[PDB]
Protein backbone atom coordinates (compact mmCIF):
# COMPACT_ATOMS: atom_id res chain seq x y z
CA UNK A 1 0.00 0.00 0.00
CA UNK A 2 1.08 3.63 -0.52
CA UNK A 3 -0.28 6.40 1.67
CA UNK A 4 -0.42 10.13 1.98
CA UNK A 5 -2.14 12.58 4.35
CA UNK A 6 -5.39 14.20 3.20
CA UNK A 7 -5.74 16.35 6.30
CA UNK A 8 -5.38 16.43 10.08
CA UNK A 9 -6.91 18.95 12.38
CA UNK A 10 -7.71 19.48 16.04
CA UNK A 11 -9.21 21.90 18.55
CA UNK A 12 -8.98 22.27 22.31
CA UNK A 13 -12.36 21.33 23.78
CA UNK A 14 -12.42 24.49 25.86
CA UNK A 15 -11.43 26.89 23.06
CA UNK A 16 -13.22 30.19 23.42
CA UNK A 17 -12.85 30.95 19.70
CA UNK A 18 -13.68 27.47 18.31
CA UNK A 19 -10.99 28.02 15.70
CA UNK A 20 -9.75 24.71 14.34
CA UNK A 21 -6.00 24.16 13.95
CA UNK A 22 -4.62 22.01 11.18
CA UNK A 23 -3.13 21.91 7.73
CA UNK A 24 -4.23 23.80 4.63
CA UNK A 25 -6.51 20.93 3.48
CA UNK A 26 -8.73 21.06 6.62
CA UNK A 27 -11.61 22.67 4.64
CA UNK A 28 -11.49 20.22 1.70
CA UNK A 29 -13.87 17.21 1.46
CA UNK A 30 -12.43 13.69 1.74
CA UNK A 31 -13.92 10.22 2.16
CA UNK A 32 -14.78 9.50 5.82
CA UNK A 33 -15.32 5.76 5.91
CA UNK A 34 -16.78 4.69 9.31
CA UNK A 35 -16.00 7.95 11.06
CA UNK A 36 -19.34 8.72 9.30
CA UNK A 37 -20.86 6.71 12.15
CA UNK A 38 -19.98 9.53 14.62
CA UNK A 39 -22.03 11.93 12.49
CA UNK A 40 -24.98 9.44 12.60
CA UNK A 41 -24.35 9.24 16.37
CA UNK A 42 -24.67 13.02 16.75
CA UNK A 43 -27.89 13.09 14.68
CA UNK A 44 -29.41 10.24 16.71
CA UNK A 45 -28.37 11.83 20.07
CA UNK A 46 -29.94 15.15 19.04
CA UNK A 47 -33.16 13.72 17.64
CA UNK A 48 -33.89 10.94 20.15
CA UNK A 49 -31.64 11.58 23.19
CA UNK A 50 -29.10 9.23 24.73
CA UNK A 51 -31.64 7.65 27.10
CA UNK A 52 -34.20 6.90 24.35
CA UNK A 53 -35.41 3.28 24.14
CA UNK A 54 -37.02 1.50 21.21
CA UNK A 55 -40.26 0.14 22.65
CA UNK A 56 -41.25 -2.95 20.74
CA UNK A 57 -44.83 -3.90 21.67
CA UNK A 58 -46.31 -7.41 21.75
CA UNK A 59 -50.10 -7.74 21.58
CA UNK A 60 -50.88 -11.06 23.20
CA UNK A 61 -54.29 -12.76 23.00
CA UNK A 62 -55.03 -16.15 24.61
CA UNK A 63 -56.43 -18.77 22.24
CA UNK A 64 -59.14 -21.29 22.63
CA UNK A 65 -56.76 -24.16 22.55
CA UNK A 66 -54.70 -22.78 25.46
CA UNK A 67 -51.91 -21.01 23.51
CA UNK A 68 -51.49 -17.41 22.39
CA UNK A 69 -51.62 -15.30 19.27
CA UNK A 70 -48.99 -12.56 19.28
CA UNK A 71 -48.68 -9.50 17.06
CA UNK A 72 -45.42 -7.59 17.10
CA UNK A 73 -45.86 -3.81 16.75
CA UNK A 74 -42.29 -2.89 15.82
CA UNK A 75 -40.26 0.09 17.00
CA UNK A 76 -37.58 0.06 14.31
CA UNK A 77 -35.03 -1.05 16.94
CA UNK A 78 -31.85 -1.19 14.92
CA UNK A 79 -30.18 -3.93 17.00
CA UNK A 80 -32.91 -6.61 16.97
CA UNK A 81 -31.39 -9.89 15.85
CA UNK A 82 -30.18 -13.10 17.46
CA UNK A 83 -29.41 -11.80 20.96
CA UNK A 84 -32.53 -9.68 21.45
CA UNK A 85 -34.53 -12.64 20.12
CA UNK A 86 -33.00 -14.96 22.68
CA UNK A 87 -33.84 -12.49 25.45
CA UNK A 88 -37.39 -12.14 24.12
CA UNK A 89 -37.86 -15.94 24.08
CA UNK A 90 -36.55 -16.15 27.68
CA UNK A 91 -38.97 -13.37 28.58
CA UNK A 92 -41.92 -15.03 26.83
CA UNK A 93 -41.28 -18.18 28.87
CA UNK A 94 -40.96 -16.05 32.08
CA UNK A 95 -44.40 -14.61 31.24
CA UNK A 96 -45.71 -18.24 30.82
CA UNK A 97 -45.84 -18.20 27.02
CA UNK A 98 -44.35 -21.30 25.47
CA UNK A 99 -46.58 -21.86 22.44
CA UNK A 100 -47.72 -19.34 19.89
CA UNK A 101 -50.45 -20.04 17.33
CA UNK A 102 -50.39 -17.02 14.99
CA UNK A 103 -47.33 -14.81 15.20
CA UNK A 104 -47.71 -11.65 13.13
CA UNK A 105 -45.61 -8.50 12.84
CA UNK A 106 -45.73 -5.10 11.19
CA UNK A 107 -43.50 -3.06 8.90
CA UNK A 108 -41.54 -1.52 11.78
CA UNK A 109 -40.36 -4.86 13.17
CA UNK A 110 -36.80 -4.96 11.78
CA UNK A 111 -35.15 -8.30 12.41
CA UNK A 112 -31.69 -9.18 11.18
CA UNK A 113 -30.41 -12.27 12.84
CA UNK A 114 -26.72 -11.56 12.30
CA UNK A 115 -27.05 -7.81 13.08
CA UNK A 116 -24.07 -7.86 15.54
CA UNK A 117 -21.94 -10.40 13.66
CA UNK A 118 -20.32 -11.11 10.32
CA UNK A 119 -21.40 -10.33 7.67
CA UNK A 120 -23.58 -7.43 8.76
CA UNK A 121 -20.99 -5.42 10.72
CA UNK A 122 -18.98 -4.95 7.52
CA UNK A 123 -21.51 -5.76 4.85
CA UNK A 124 -23.78 -3.73 2.58
CA UNK A 125 -26.89 -3.17 4.73
CA UNK A 126 -30.02 -4.52 2.93
CA UNK A 127 -32.15 -1.71 1.51
CA UNK A 128 -35.74 -2.83 0.75
CA UNK A 129 -37.93 -1.17 -1.86
CA UNK A 130 -41.28 -2.09 -0.28
CA UNK A 131 -42.44 -3.26 3.13
CA UNK A 132 -43.73 -6.48 1.59
CA UNK A 133 -40.23 -7.38 0.38
CA UNK A 134 -38.79 -6.54 3.84
CA UNK A 135 -41.46 -8.62 5.51
CA UNK A 136 -40.97 -11.58 3.27
CA UNK A 137 -37.46 -11.74 4.60
CA UNK A 138 -38.44 -11.07 8.26
CA UNK A 139 -41.03 -13.93 7.99
CA UNK A 140 -38.35 -16.23 6.70
CA UNK A 141 -35.96 -15.28 9.52
CA UNK A 142 -38.69 -15.78 12.15
CA UNK A 143 -39.44 -19.18 10.67
CA UNK A 144 -35.83 -20.37 10.28
CA UNK A 145 -34.24 -18.79 13.37
CA UNK A 146 -36.63 -17.33 15.87
CA UNK A 147 -38.89 -20.38 15.96
CA UNK A 148 -36.28 -23.10 15.86
CA UNK A 149 -34.10 -24.59 18.63
CA UNK A 150 -31.81 -22.06 20.24
CA UNK A 151 -28.08 -22.57 19.75
CA UNK A 152 -26.70 -23.66 23.09
CA UNK A 153 -23.31 -22.06 22.50
CA UNK A 154 -24.49 -18.64 21.45
CA UNK A 155 -27.22 -18.65 24.11
CA UNK A 156 -24.92 -19.51 27.04
CA UNK A 157 -22.40 -16.82 25.96
CA UNK A 158 -25.22 -14.28 25.94
CA UNK A 159 -26.72 -15.41 29.22
CA UNK A 160 -23.37 -15.13 31.00
CA UNK A 161 -22.87 -11.64 29.64
CA UNK A 162 -26.40 -10.64 30.61
CA UNK A 163 -25.77 -11.80 34.18
CA UNK A 164 -22.80 -9.40 34.33
CA UNK A 165 -25.16 -6.53 33.80
CA UNK A 166 -27.78 -7.81 36.23
CA UNK A 167 -30.24 -9.33 33.73
CA UNK A 168 -31.84 -12.75 34.42
CA UNK A 169 -32.40 -15.28 31.63
CA UNK A 170 -33.56 -18.80 31.81
CA UNK A 171 -31.32 -21.81 31.26
CA UNK A 172 -33.41 -23.65 28.63
CA UNK A 173 -35.65 -21.27 26.78
CA UNK A 174 -37.93 -22.66 24.06
CA UNK A 175 -40.90 -21.43 21.96
CA UNK A 176 -43.12 -23.28 19.45
CA UNK A 177 -44.77 -21.17 16.71
CA UNK A 178 -47.46 -22.51 14.38
CA UNK A 179 -47.94 -19.81 11.71
CA UNK A 180 -46.03 -16.56 10.89
CA UNK A 181 -47.29 -13.71 8.70
CA UNK A 182 -46.92 -10.03 7.97
CA UNK A 183 -49.76 -7.71 9.05
CA UNK A 184 -49.25 -4.00 8.32
CA UNK A 185 -49.90 -1.59 11.10
CA UNK A 186 -52.95 -0.14 9.25
CA UNK A 187 -54.41 -3.69 9.12
CA UNK A 188 -53.84 -4.42 12.78
CA UNK A 189 -56.26 -3.59 15.56
CA UNK A 190 -55.93 -5.40 18.84
CA UNK A 191 -58.34 -8.10 20.02
CA UNK A 192 -60.66 -7.26 22.89
CA UNK A 193 -58.99 -9.55 25.43
CA UNK A 194 -55.42 -8.73 24.25
CA UNK A 195 -52.67 -7.72 26.67
CA UNK A 196 -50.00 -5.34 25.48
CA UNK A 197 -46.48 -6.18 26.66
CA UNK A 198 -43.54 -3.83 26.05
CA UNK A 199 -39.99 -4.96 25.33
CA UNK A 200 -37.69 -1.93 25.56
CA UNK A 201 -34.25 -1.95 23.96
CA UNK A 202 -31.19 -0.86 25.88
CA UNK A 203 -30.91 2.92 25.78
CA UNK A 204 -29.73 4.60 22.61
CA UNK A 205 -26.36 5.41 24.19
CA UNK A 206 -25.72 1.64 24.55
CA UNK A 207 -26.83 0.87 20.98
CA UNK A 208 -24.48 3.65 19.78
CA UNK A 209 -21.61 2.30 22.00
CA UNK A 210 -22.02 -1.13 20.43
CA UNK A 211 -22.15 0.36 16.92
CA UNK A 212 -19.01 2.50 17.45
CA UNK A 213 -17.14 -0.32 19.16
CA UNK A 214 -17.71 -2.76 16.33
CA UNK A 215 -18.04 -0.29 13.45
CA UNK A 216 -21.46 -1.82 12.78
CA UNK A 217 -22.88 -0.90 9.36
CA UNK A 218 -26.32 -2.38 9.99
CA UNK A 219 -26.97 -0.29 13.09
CA UNK A 220 -25.57 2.94 11.48
CA UNK A 221 -27.50 2.57 8.25
CA UNK A 222 -30.76 1.75 9.96
CA UNK A 223 -30.45 4.69 12.42
CA UNK A 224 -29.85 7.04 9.45
CA UNK A 225 -32.89 5.65 7.57
CA UNK A 226 -35.04 5.74 10.70
CA UNK A 227 -34.29 9.46 11.15
CA UNK A 228 -35.43 10.23 7.59
CA UNK A 229 -32.44 9.37 5.40
CA UNK A 230 -30.43 11.73 3.27
CA UNK A 231 -33.04 14.42 2.66
CA UNK A 232 -33.64 14.70 6.42
CA UNK A 233 -29.93 14.56 7.21
CA UNK A 234 -29.11 17.36 4.84
CA UNK A 235 -31.71 19.59 6.45
CA UNK A 236 -30.56 18.62 9.96
CA UNK A 237 -26.93 19.52 9.22
CA UNK A 238 -27.89 22.76 7.42
CA UNK A 239 -29.91 23.83 10.47
CA UNK A 240 -27.34 22.55 13.03
CA UNK A 241 -24.06 23.73 11.50
CA UNK A 242 -25.06 26.02 8.66
CA UNK A 243 -23.35 23.47 6.49
CA UNK A 244 -24.08 22.50 2.96
CA UNK A 245 -22.90 19.98 0.33
CA UNK A 246 -19.52 21.70 0.11
CA UNK A 247 -18.90 20.89 3.78
CA UNK A 248 -20.48 17.45 4.06
CA UNK A 249 -22.14 15.07 1.57
CA UNK A 250 -23.72 11.93 2.99
CA UNK A 251 -25.55 9.05 1.31
CA UNK A 252 -25.84 6.58 4.19
CA UNK A 253 -25.23 6.34 7.92
CA UNK A 254 -22.29 3.88 7.82
CA UNK A 255 -19.75 5.37 5.46
CA UNK A 256 -19.67 2.16 3.42
CA UNK A 257 -19.62 2.26 -0.40
CA UNK A 258 -23.21 3.04 -1.38
CA UNK A 259 -22.65 2.51 -5.12
CA UNK A 260 -21.29 -0.12 -7.49
CA UNK A 261 -17.73 -1.30 -7.95
CA UNK A 262 -17.24 0.88 -11.04
CA UNK A 263 -19.36 3.81 -9.68
CA UNK A 264 -18.64 3.89 -5.99
CA UNK A 265 -20.11 6.48 -3.71
CA UNK A 266 -18.69 7.35 -0.29
CA UNK A 267 -19.70 9.87 2.37
CA UNK A 268 -17.31 12.82 2.39
CA UNK A 269 -16.77 15.82 4.61
CA UNK A 270 -14.05 18.25 5.63
CA UNK A 271 -11.81 17.71 8.61
CA UNK A 272 -13.22 20.90 10.16
CA UNK A 273 -16.73 19.41 9.98
CA UNK A 274 -15.54 16.37 11.91
CA UNK A 275 -14.26 18.61 14.71
CA UNK A 276 -17.54 20.55 14.78
CA UNK A 277 -19.42 17.18 14.98
CA UNK A 278 -17.35 16.14 17.97
CA UNK A 279 -17.79 19.44 19.74
CA UNK A 280 -21.56 19.31 19.17
CA UNK A 281 -21.88 15.64 20.15
CA UNK A 282 -19.81 16.28 23.39
CA UNK A 283 -22.07 19.29 24.15
CA UNK A 284 -25.33 17.26 23.58
CA UNK A 285 -24.08 14.35 25.71
CA UNK A 286 -22.81 16.65 28.52
CA UNK A 287 -26.28 18.18 28.81
CA UNK A 288 -27.50 14.70 29.74
CA UNK A 289 -24.58 13.88 32.04
CA UNK A 290 -22.62 11.71 29.60
CA UNK A 291 -19.15 11.79 27.93
CA UNK A 292 -17.97 10.73 24.48
CA UNK A 293 -16.89 7.42 26.13
CA UNK A 294 -20.61 6.64 26.65
CA UNK A 295 -21.08 6.33 22.83
CA UNK A 296 -17.57 5.85 21.35
CA UNK A 297 -14.75 3.40 22.01
CA UNK A 298 -11.86 4.07 24.43
CA UNK A 299 -8.44 2.97 23.30
CA UNK A 300 -7.20 -0.15 25.10
CA UNK A 301 -10.00 -0.07 27.64
CA UNK A 302 -12.73 -1.23 25.27
CA UNK A 303 -11.23 -4.56 24.41
CA UNK A 304 -14.26 -5.51 22.28
CA UNK A 305 -13.69 -2.62 19.89
CA UNK A 306 -11.58 -1.59 16.95
CA UNK A 307 -9.29 0.41 19.27
CA UNK A 308 -8.86 -2.25 21.96
CA UNK A 309 -5.46 -3.03 20.44
CA UNK A 310 -4.24 0.56 20.62
CA UNK A 311 -1.52 1.11 23.17
CA UNK A 312 1.09 3.63 24.04
CA UNK A 313 -0.01 7.04 25.20
CA UNK A 314 -3.43 6.57 23.57
CA UNK A 315 -4.37 3.72 25.95
CA UNK A 316 -6.98 4.92 28.42
CA UNK A 317 -6.68 8.56 27.24
CA UNK A 318 -8.24 8.51 23.79
CA UNK A 319 -11.91 8.09 22.73
CA UNK A 320 -12.05 7.48 19.00
CA UNK A 321 -13.72 5.98 15.96
CA UNK A 322 -11.75 4.26 13.19
CA UNK A 323 -12.66 4.01 9.53
CA UNK A 324 -11.31 2.20 6.50
CA UNK A 325 -12.43 1.95 2.88
CA UNK A 326 -10.39 1.27 -0.27
CA UNK A 327 -9.10 4.86 -0.61
CA UNK A 328 -9.20 6.16 2.91
CA UNK A 329 -8.17 5.32 6.41
CA UNK A 330 -9.43 7.68 9.10
CA UNK A 331 -9.65 8.24 12.87
CA UNK A 332 -11.40 10.95 14.92
CA UNK A 333 -12.22 11.54 18.51
CA UNK A 334 -10.77 13.16 21.62
CA UNK A 335 -7.49 12.84 23.43
CA UNK A 336 -7.26 13.61 27.13
CA UNK A 337 -3.88 15.24 27.91
CA UNK A 338 -2.22 17.01 30.78
CA UNK A 339 -3.28 20.27 29.02
CA UNK A 340 -6.90 19.21 28.64
CA UNK A 341 -9.14 17.44 26.16
CA UNK A 342 -8.51 17.99 22.45
CA UNK A 343 -10.71 16.96 19.53
CA UNK A 344 -8.95 15.57 16.48
CA UNK A 345 -9.49 14.05 13.09
CA UNK A 346 -6.98 12.40 10.78
CA UNK A 347 -7.90 11.56 7.17
CA UNK A 348 -5.40 9.48 5.15
CA UNK A 349 -5.40 8.44 1.53
CA UNK A 350 -4.62 4.74 0.76
CA UNK A 351 -3.68 3.04 -2.46
CA UNK A 352 -3.58 -0.77 -2.00
CA UNK A 353 -2.50 -1.52 -5.56
CA UNK A 354 1.03 -0.07 -4.99
CA UNK A 355 4.12 -1.09 -3.00
CA UNK A 356 2.50 -4.31 -1.92
CA UNK A 357 5.41 -5.16 0.33
CA UNK A 358 4.23 -2.31 2.62
CA UNK A 359 1.38 -2.86 5.00
CA UNK A 360 -0.14 -1.20 8.06
CA UNK A 361 1.23 2.09 6.78
CA UNK A 362 -1.77 4.33 7.23
CA UNK A 363 -2.70 2.93 10.63
CA UNK A 364 0.76 3.44 11.98
CA UNK A 365 1.00 7.00 10.58
CA UNK A 366 -2.33 7.85 12.27
CA UNK A 367 -1.18 6.35 15.61
CA UNK A 368 2.09 8.26 15.42
CA UNK A 369 0.32 11.55 14.68
CA UNK A 370 -2.22 11.16 17.49
CA UNK A 371 0.54 10.10 19.91
CA UNK A 372 2.52 13.16 18.93
CA UNK A 373 -0.53 15.38 19.60
CA UNK A 374 -0.85 13.90 23.08
CA UNK A 375 2.86 14.27 23.84
CA UNK A 376 3.05 17.92 22.58
CA UNK A 377 0.32 18.54 25.20
CA UNK A 378 2.25 17.18 28.12
CA UNK A 379 1.36 13.50 27.73
CA UNK A 380 -1.79 11.49 28.44
CA UNK A 381 -4.25 11.99 31.25
CA UNK A 382 -6.38 8.88 31.87
CA UNK A 383 -10.07 9.47 31.49
CA UNK A 384 -12.64 8.28 34.01
CA UNK A 385 -13.96 5.16 32.33
CA UNK A 386 -14.95 1.60 33.19
CA UNK A 387 -15.27 -0.80 30.26
CA UNK A 388 -18.94 -1.17 29.26
CA UNK A 389 -20.78 -4.32 28.14
CA UNK A 390 -23.30 -3.01 25.56
CA UNK A 391 -25.91 -5.66 24.89
CA UNK A 392 -29.17 -4.99 22.95
CA UNK A 393 -31.15 -5.14 26.23
CA UNK A 394 -30.51 -4.23 29.86
CA UNK A 395 -32.15 -4.70 33.26
CA UNK A 396 -35.02 -2.38 32.23
CA UNK A 397 -35.82 -4.36 29.04
CA UNK A 398 -37.94 -7.03 30.67
CA UNK A 399 -41.34 -7.62 29.13
CA UNK A 400 -43.77 -5.53 31.03
CA UNK A 401 -47.58 -5.34 30.81
CA UNK A 402 -48.75 -1.92 29.82
Residue numbers in the entry: 37 to 438
Study authors write:
Bdellovibrio bacteriovorus are small predatory bacteria which invade the periplasm of other Gram-negative bacteria, round up these (typically formerly rod-shaped) prey bacteria into spherical, osmotically stable structures called bdelloplasts, kill the prey and replicate within them. Essential to bdelloplast “sculpting” is modification, by the Bdellovibrio, of the prey cell wall peptidoglycan in the prey bacterium's periplasm. In this study we have discovered a novel use of some evolutionarily diversified class C PBPs, by the predatory bacterium Bdellovibrio bacteriovorus HD100 when they invade prey and construct the osmotically stable bdelloplast from the prey cell. Compared to the active enzyme, Bd3459 (S70A) bound significantly less Bocillin-FL as would be predicted. Together these data establish that Bd3459 is a PBP with DD-carboxy- and DD-endopeptidase activity, as suggested by the bioinformatic analysis of the protein sequence.
We solved the crystal structure of Bd3459 to 1.45 Å and this revealed predation-associated domain differences to conventional PBP4 housekeeping enzymes (loss of the regulatory domain III, alteration of domain II and a more exposed active site). Bd3459 is comprised of three domains, two of which are found in other PBP4 proteins, the classical “TP” transpeptidase domain (domain I; K38-D87 and P239-L427), and an associated domain (domain II; Y88-A238 and P428-C terminus). The largest structural difference in Bd3459 in comparison to the PBP4-grouping of enzymes is the absence from Bd3459 of a classical domain III, an all-beta structure that sits adjacent to the TP active site in conventional PBP4s and is responsible for PBP4 dimerization. Domain III has also been postulated to regulate substrate access and limit the ability of PBP4 proteins to bind bulky substrates. It is of interest (and relevance to the wide diversity of bacterial prey walls that Bdellovibrio attack) that Bd3459 possesses no compensatory regions in this part of the fold, leading to a much more accessible active site. The domain II:III:TP contacts of housekeeping PBP4 enzymes are replaced in Bd3459 by a region of novel structure, composed of AA 144–210. When building and refining the Bd3459 structure, it was apparent that a covalent modification of S70 had occurred during purification/crystallization. After being unable to crystallize the protein when HEPES/MES was excluded, we have tentatively modelled the adduct as a covalently attached HEPES molecule, with disorder distal to the C9/C10 atoms. The tetrahedral arrangement of the reacted sulphonyl group is reminiscent of a transpeptidase acylenzyme transition state, with atom O1 occupying the classical “oxyanion hole” formed by the backbone amide groups of S70 and S360. When comparing the Bd3459 and PBP4 structures, this sequence insertion takes effect between N292 and N303 and forms a “thumb-like” hairpin on the periphery of the active site pocket.
